[PDB]
Design a protein around this nucleic acid. Structure first.
Lengths: 98, 60, 100, 206
RNA sequence: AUGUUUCUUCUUUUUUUUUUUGGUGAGAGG
RNA sequence: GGCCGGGAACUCAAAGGAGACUGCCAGUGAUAAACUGGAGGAAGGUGGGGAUGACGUCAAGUCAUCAUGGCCCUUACGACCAGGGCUACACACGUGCUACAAUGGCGCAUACAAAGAGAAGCGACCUCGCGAGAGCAAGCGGACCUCAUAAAGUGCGUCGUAGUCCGGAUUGGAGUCUGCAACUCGACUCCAUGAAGUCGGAAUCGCUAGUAAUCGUGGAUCAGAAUGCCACGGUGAAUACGU
RNA sequence: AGAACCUUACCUGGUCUUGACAUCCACGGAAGUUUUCAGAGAUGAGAAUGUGCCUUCGGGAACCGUGAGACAGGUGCUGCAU
């Protein structure tokens, strides 16, 4: 029920960053409704690489913003106690959805 | 009595229940029909948007 | 661009946050299905009492790094030549070559 | 009109970024420009300190600044004395609390930026580049680098035309994505215009 | 078939770190 | 009504691996490399596409992104404001769009996408409105909500080779929203109008497959303003004797 | 990657110059906010009201005006000085 929505850039980091909150929630609640995939936005950009004419030369840039869900099922009064102020992975913006 | 909980969008609130107790935040969204306030707590920097009841949090 | 041009923008920033979006009720409610007599004439004309350069439509769009007029990108908030040198320097968190 | 940036295209497999955080679309420009002034003022504050790269990690409502230098003492000042002066003003620039942190590199003859600004200090004090850029090459060949190419361009030597010269020693596989390459740029302002320097340093695998 | 003139040089010397288990009450020995 | 219990194989989703390496067979080839078929296989000779662009060439382009040696102005070539111009018009060229119709146009009924965008932002629903839109206002700071009810396709009716139910430029009138502001100089809409043009001379361009062609959608830019540019998916060819 | 104004670097014309914008120094004035307006607007003439912090209260920081200047500024020329 209690959703936890993850947001990051480094997809090779978020699977361990969600694993860092899996282990923080496993030893407390013992029931977590999985690391759901949650599709990622691919914000596409294109830029004139020249500082002038020849609008044929361009470079394409994108940012895959990856999402996850943790979704703590039961609100036993020790699970969230081990979550608030006890997280990590600087650069991975986290959020609850409840 | 101490029952202050009314918070509109952008209004700061106070949490005194659950692990989010002793923390303040703002209510980005409100739900009078569901009797729930959408406020996030600055936990480890990142805002932690969580739903708290009017009695679960106090108006700031 | 010009140091003269970048100064006009922040001056027109100071008009867009003091007068407009705050004294914007001059057209929001009073220039509608309300009293459509010549009191509604006082709605459109008092909007002219505020300066012309105060509207958010007047604040064009300029880069923040160098202030180039054209080739702007809203996401990065800065000019197209400046988003690329910072892409190759490794400044925007996540821009790699889109080679899909 | 060729040769796209080495530090540009490796940023998903070899080398990390220099600003690692996530901010949404409303505050993406606000986060980015604040990074630009903490890179401008700090390099301005620590020009002589031989700083190569700066890492900016914001976990939201905070900023972890990392400074990679070959001169640790000058960066930290006297046991952190200059850092607290920065702490008052780095937090004043980005408008957010700043946890200043310091890293280091042991071999400045293998870090691209440290090789490049060295020739910048050389060529702005009126020295011959031919044995100044040769100096940097023979430095890295015996310091553990598998290969290094150094390029200088401009109207060097006081000449009328822009004589350009490049020189390498060892492997520099620019195309190979498996090949790590340390590359950075620096420019020198003499009275003979601007002389830009570019240097590539190859190390190895994933 | 045709496409003006004149019209572009090299040094070889240059380079410091490094951090300044207390109180109270009683008894006893000299 | 996947709407509700419920299910975890499936589509899908997001991570990590398996997999295609001339690895196996046969002929050919100097017991070479390798080539031409066959087998198994989702895929086979770099599977398809993309990024990636060697020293140098034009002493190519940019001093107008920015940086910068000179050179020069500094009651100025610097600066501030209102209005105009960049859109002006005998004429030629470049690049596109709409068409010249019958595998076509108009009306009715109905099928099938992908990808992307969204907070002083996208906007259901209901309601006034022929229409552009307006009022009240769900939800959604987002696989859930919305933009957003795809187009040819098909089934049928129907016009009948005509400058005409083709084409719709231009022109008059009445209005819609954005914005201080639509006159010079926005887009759009309703009613009216109805041009040239009836497949294009010398010459020239693109393309070898999910390509050409054709159809519709989305996006960045953006107060507003695409037929352009950048992306997406639907439909789906011909020919390659050969140097 | 989109000129109605802005953009805009151009023209007609109205104005201003240690200045549209920055560092430094001198003295006054907090800053701010509301209103009448000269005029096309700029700028200028004003009229109310407010006069916050540090107290080294004989002054700093935040900030506006006035004065002297050292300067600032240039989408001005040279891409064959770079």
């Amino acid at each position: 029920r209690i959703r936890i929505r993850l947001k990051a850039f480094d997809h090779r980091l978020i699977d361990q960053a969600t694993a860092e909150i899996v282990e923080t929630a496993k030893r407390t609640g013992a029931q977590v409704r999985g690391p759901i995939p949650l599709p990622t936005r691919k914000e596409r950009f294109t830029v004139l690489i020249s500082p002038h004419v020849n609008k044929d030369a361009r470079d394409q840039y994108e940012i895959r913003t990856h999402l996850r869900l943790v979704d703590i099922v039961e609100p036993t009064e020790k699970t969230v106690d081990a979550l608030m102020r006890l997280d990590l992975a600087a650069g991975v913006d986290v959020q609850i959805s409840l | 009595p101490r029952p202050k909980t009314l918070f509109e969008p952008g209004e700061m609130v106070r949490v005194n229940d659950g692990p989010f107790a002793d923390f303040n935040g703002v209510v980005e969204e409100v739900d009078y029909e569901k009797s729930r306030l959408k406020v996030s707590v600055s936990i480890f920097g990142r805002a932690t948007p969580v739903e708290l009841d009017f009695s679960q949090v106090e108006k700031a | 661009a010009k140091q003269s041009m970048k100064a006009r923008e922040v001056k027109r920033v100071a008009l867009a946050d003091k007068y407009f979006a705050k004294r914007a009720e001059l057209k929001a409610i009073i220039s509608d299905v309300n009293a459509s007599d010549e009191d509604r004439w006082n709605a459109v004309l008092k909007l002219q009492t505020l300066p012309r350069d105060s509207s958010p439509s007047r604040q064009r769009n300029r880069c923040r790094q160098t202030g180039r007029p054209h080739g702007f990108l809203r996401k990065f908030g800065l000019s197209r030549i400046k988003v690329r040198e910072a892409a190759m320097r490794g400044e925007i968190p996540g821009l790699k070559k889109a080679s899909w | 009109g060729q040769k796209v940036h080495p530090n540009g295209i490796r940023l998903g497999i070899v080398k990390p970024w220099n600003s690692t955080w996530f901010a949404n679309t409303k505050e993406f420009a606000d986060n980015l420009d604040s990074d630009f002034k903490v890179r401008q003022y700090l390099t301005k504050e620590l020009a002589k300190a031989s700083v190569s790269r700066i890492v900016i990690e914001r976990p939201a409502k905070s900023i972890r600044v990392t400074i990679h230098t070959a001169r640790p003492g000058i960066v930290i000042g006297k046991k952190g004395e200059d850092v607290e002066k920065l702490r008052k003003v780095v937090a004043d620039i980005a408008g957010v609390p700043a946890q200043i942190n310091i890293a280091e590199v042991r071999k400045p003859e293998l870090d691209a930026k440290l090789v490049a600004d060295s020739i910048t200090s050389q060529l702005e004090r009126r020295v011959m580049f031919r044995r100044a850029m040769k100096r940097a090459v023979q430095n890295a060949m015996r310091l553990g680098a598998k290969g290094i190419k150094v390029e200088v361009s401009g109207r060097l030597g006081g000449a009328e035309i822009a004589r350009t010269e490049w020189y390498r020693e060892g492997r520099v596989p620019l195309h190979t994505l498996r090949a790590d390459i340390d590359y950075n740029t620096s420019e020198a302002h003499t009275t003979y215009g601007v002389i830009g320097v570019k240097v590539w340093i190859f190390k190895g695998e994933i």
